[PDB]
Amino acid sequence: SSVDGASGAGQLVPEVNASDPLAMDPVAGSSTAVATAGQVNPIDPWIINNFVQAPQGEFTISPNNTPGDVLFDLSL
Amino acid sequence: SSVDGASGAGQLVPEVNASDPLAMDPVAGSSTAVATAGQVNPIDPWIINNFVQAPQGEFTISPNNTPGDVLFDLSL
Amino acid sequence: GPHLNPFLLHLSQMYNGWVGNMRVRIMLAGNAFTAGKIIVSCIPPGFGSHNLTIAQATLFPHVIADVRTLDPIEVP
Known part of the structure; x- marks a missing residue:
């Protein structure tokens, strides 16, 4: 999938x-929830390893940007 | 002989x-001609491995050239 | 489809069915003085022709190649 120009x-x-x-x-x-959650719902293994572009997937750096400027703020 | 700038x-x-x-x-x-040619004439072994500039040895690519332009047409 | 290859295409007019895999090669022409990447995504049949985001293109099995690549990019 990933081919860096190395x-x-x-x-x-x-x-x-x-x-x-x-x-x-x-x-x-x-491991934490197992005992108290009503269910522990597994997800498609194919999603488990595919690095996909997040909805907050883009940002841009330019000489107009000044250090301190937030490029992106992701919350788990 | 050949020294690429690697x-x-x-x-x-x-x-x-x-x-x-x-x-x-x-x-x-x-192998083909051996039986019917009158002679099979060998050539100087020194010619056998020297990559020499062919008579049609030069060509040039420029931004004026457009894809499809023939740079050279060699016939055996 | 057989239509991708003129030979196959010409042949399709003689048989009434087909199955198989093709091999695709993308070849780019660039210097060591360039930069930029391309992305090829494999879209399954039964999806739709709706337009995508580069981010979304990542969600499909894909290949991202850097423009400087010399060797042809093969994608099944």
């Missing part, structure tokens, strides 16, 4: 982003 | 050409 991008841009891990512990999923 | 060409251009094989079977050489 092959022909020369080496002018960085491929992977080198960054320190998130200062945050992992959080549990469904 | 070393200093960065990675802005493709080195080798990736392409599907020729939709065509290999053809036989001299």
Whole structure:
């Protein structure tokens, strides 16, 4: 699906982003609700791995933008 | 003999050409004539591997050229 | 459909049915000095001809290629 121009991008841009891990512990999923929710409804496995464009899927950076400007604010 | 700028060409251009094989079977050489030609005359082995500039050795592409323009037409 | 290939097309007029898969190759002509990506989405039959967002195009099994690619993009 994803084909980054690595092959022909020369080496002018960085491929992977080198960054320190998130200062945050992992959080549990469904395991919590299992006992008190009336039902635990599973979803189509095909959705489980497809990275699809979110409804808040676009944003733009321009030289008019000034640091601090919010490009997008996603709420879980 | 051939020294492509690979070393200093960065990675802005493709080195080798990736392409599907020729939709065509290999053809036989001299084996055919051996029996009916009066002679089968061998050529200097030094010519056998030297890639030399053909008499129809030059052509030019320019933004004036339009797709379909024949750059060269070689007949065996 | 057989109509995509003139050979097949010519043949369809001799048989009354068909089944099978084709192979598609997209080939782009660009420098190492360009940038931009294209996206090909596989749309199943029985969907509709409604227009999509690039974001939506992502929701289908897809291929996103960078313009600089040298090798042909093959999509089944």
